[PDB]
Symmetry: D4
Subunit: 121 residues, 8 copies
């Protein structure tokens, strides 16, 4: 099964970061979420109830990215993946990518970050 649902380039202003100054000032975090879901029934019925609603998905992502400040990107991505899988049975697997296009790194790069893939149990 290679069907997916996606939310690309979501961006949030949060105060996460290991450096005290990071949590003080804050920055923009870019998030990509890809969910493994079978979409043939929904594609057959045309009934939004036979699939996963993204607006809802976006609400989960948001509430986490714009919530309490944490240290690592790995913690935010793990809270999002775990949160999405717990609420939706149809999501067979969840992939979370978080990019920090402007970390406290003296240099020229397009962005830094992490990505994780969490299968639904």
């Amino acid at each position: 099964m290679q069907d997916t649902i996606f939310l690309k380039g979501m961006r949030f202003y949060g105060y996460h970061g290991a450096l005290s100054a990071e949590n003080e000032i804050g920055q923009i975090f870019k998030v990509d979420v890809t969910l493994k879901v079978d979409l043939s029934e929904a594609g057959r019925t045309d009934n939004v109830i036979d699939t996963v609603h993204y607006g809802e998905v976006f609400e989960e992502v948001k509430s986490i990215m714009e919530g309490k400040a944490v240290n690592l990107l790995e913690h935010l991505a793990e809270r999002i993946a775990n949160r999405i899988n717990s609420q939706y049975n149809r999501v067979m697997e969840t992939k979370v990518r978080i990019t920090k296009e402007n970390p406290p790194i003296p240099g020229h790069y397009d962005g830094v970050g992490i990505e994780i893939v969490r299968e639904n149990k």
Copy 2:
């Protein structure tokens, strides 16, 4: 076999959507279509008859994206995949991606959507 034929970034203005206001106003839908096809004969002969004509492919995609208004993206992608496979034997498999870069989602993201891969029977 890893050969493909592609039509990237096709965009259509349709009135699909689960929200009544969506079907009223309308929006732009971006579509990516990748077809699995063996192109060595055509690459050998140089005869357009030994391959799949995209302009035709685009016509199928268009007629569906700019046709009657439906509820889900999964329905549009399933009508396109099913329609392409039924008309072309050379297409061993069809992948359809539809992006809604501006859904009724209060936030900042690059786009939301779905993707499906339908092997030809």
Copy 3:
């Protein structure tokens, strides 16, 4: 005097629009603000008090773009220009540009909108 202060590409999700469906669903509004201000003293002193603070400027723009829903872009731009000039004497003139990259217009365009220039009285 050709010095300016600028805030480019600010984007807000608001429910402004003349069509009822527009106010229902909402969309993203992109805003560009250019202020006429003499920056030689501040450039000489290096004292933020001798110039106009943008973060503050952004707060004014935001509070208007993300406030009550209105009909026209001309009303939002006029509320922003009038609001910026009333609060800052150093701003000799204010230019406001608002773009609706996705209005209820069946077609392919990069965006539509208005721009106004309001000298400070």
Copy 4:
């Protein structure tokens, strides 16, 4: 008066061109339209009747770009400018820009084209 209304990046597939092969095949034409209009009343009242409706403007542009095939870009831009000024008194002046990003020119360039500014009489 430096207020304006704009429609940027409109794109149409038309068959205009001096070369017979151009009119046969066709291409995409990108159009930018900037109208000189006083928007303080509309910005004051918030009444769409006190300003120029772009969707209407876009309809005029479209009907010309997607109408009969002509030879020059100068003819299309002159038909659009003349057409916009004749229908709207509030438009003090109209600027039309048409770009042919893919003319029959053997080379590497981003695009070619013309621009005209037509004051309303």
Copy 5:
């Protein structure tokens, strides 16, 4: 072995096409070439003789894209793949992608095209 050598976004103005008008006028063709090659020796020695020279590769691609006019993209990609493999033993496999961002297709899309992967015999 997942090492590769690449030449991305090469663009050529050629007169290939099935439509007579296409061969008359011409257009820009974008080409992506990815070659499978083991680069540890060259990465170890730092000797350009232990690897595949791209400038040479580009010369082969060019001479084909800017040579006699043919009908299909599949023919150009097959002439390039076959030509690269015949001249270089180190290339274990060659992938050719050709995009026609402006074919004679009445519509709005980012580009159309084909891709092929040819293992070296």
Copy 6:
């Protein structure tokens, strides 16, 4: 008179440069050309003879950018402006912009260059 004709982003691979190594290796030069021309007659008649043909213009630019290697950008832009004005009476003024996006400058910048405006005598 604010009408213009334009050729944007033309790019050529030439060996111009003050540094011997520059003339040896070569680089890509990006060129923008804006010509002042009255386009109302041509816009009225639709006759390409009542205006300035760009393809021709591009040929002049090309023959200079891809010709003998010189030292300065100012020399190339002056040869182009002077060449365009001498051949076309309708061009009331010519503006030439040449960008070196990759000069021998150790740093991170989008590009360097010059621009000149030459009225036709």
Copy 7:
């Protein structure tokens, strides 16, 4: 005289900022420099001595952007403009633009900043 010399998109990682946390962490500053200079002699002679060398210009900009940490953008732009005019007589006027694409501003915008134009005395 409308000739200019330009350096666009220069970017530097500096620790300037009014907020202590800003000077601690640092960020990327984007700089645009446009110099008013008559380039007809240099365009006539082709002698780099009859014009202003940008690499040198870039060195001045750099040494200031990557030097001691200051409070305002207005101070950096004033040090650059003043520094360029003092060293080059041919520069009739200097324009400096500095953008902070990621200031400590909780929001979504493309960038904030200032611009100044300093005529040479």
Copy 8:
């Protein structure tokens, strides 16, 4: 395990190259680094000590890209991969991509380069 850590679009100005003129003048090298690392513990603990610090990673990449001049890209990528794996046990595998967007290649392409994947021993 499909988790990764990434640093995309890092760019450095180095003097590497097989052509003497290349080492003389220099150019910008773009680097992409993807590291295979298990991020569930760190995602669970939120402790930066349970993962690989990128700023450190960037320092290794930098010191190599901005160090002594070498001949091939394969040598730089092999020094980076080997250097990252030797210093971090958590990195199960390292992928290095280096692009030369402006090599001494007379043509129009987006960039050329190599990529390697080095599993950690």
